[PDB]
């Protein structure tokens, strides 16, 4: 069960951005991938302070940061949407939202140890989207891997309609166009 993600490149994957649903938590006018790079300036101020730290955490797992950027963007609006860091209905723990039924949460919510955690587990979900369709392309394998960080890798049942049954309908879209915001803010 080999890890092989280096290849992937975050700058190379289609994205049509946020659906209505999603671009309405900030009342957007804003449709797609418009909305979703709206999405992530609304929460860079916040995003700023753990950029060391997600600086870090992607150099130490060879995944960019920018990707750890958008998932937290997307997951917890970079803390703006949690209370002490848990999700609504305190099972979504950190800035990355790791769901404490599925696993053991390790670090403070805002921690270094907590940003390894939430991406060790996107990092899984792209090695099993990559052996559950070998043949994809490597991009495609990396939106689905993203898709599959809010609705497991059995929801990846096929190569078209990936974000279909993701919150939102659109999960692994805005989480591209959101860290490729991102990217072009250093990130
Ligand atoms: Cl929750």
Do not use: C
């Amino acid at each position: 069960h080999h890890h092989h993600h280096h290849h992937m490149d975050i700058t190379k994957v289609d994205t049509s951005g946020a659906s209505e649903i999603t671009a309405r938590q900030d009342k957007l006018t804003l449709q797609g991938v418009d909305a979703s790079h709206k999405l992530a300036e609304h929460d860079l101020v916040r995003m700023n302070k753990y950029k060391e730290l997600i600086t870090r955490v992607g150099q130490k797992h060879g995944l960019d940061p920018a990707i750890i950027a958008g998932i937290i963007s997307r997951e917890s609006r970079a803390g703006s949407a949690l209370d002490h860091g848990w999700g609504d209905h305190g099972k979504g723990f950190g800035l990355m939202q790791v769901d404490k039924r599925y696993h053991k949460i390790v670090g403070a919510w805002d921690s270094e140890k907590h940003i390894s955690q939430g991406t060790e587990i996107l990092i899984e979900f792209i090695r099993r989207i990559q052996a559950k369709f070998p043949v994809w392309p490597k991009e495609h394998q990396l939106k689905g891997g993203i898709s599959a960080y809010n609705a497991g890798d059995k929801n990846v049942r096929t190569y078209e309609r990936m974000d279909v049954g993701t919150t939102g309908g659109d999960y692994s879209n805005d989480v591209v166009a959101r860290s490729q915001w991102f990217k072009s803010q250093g990130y």
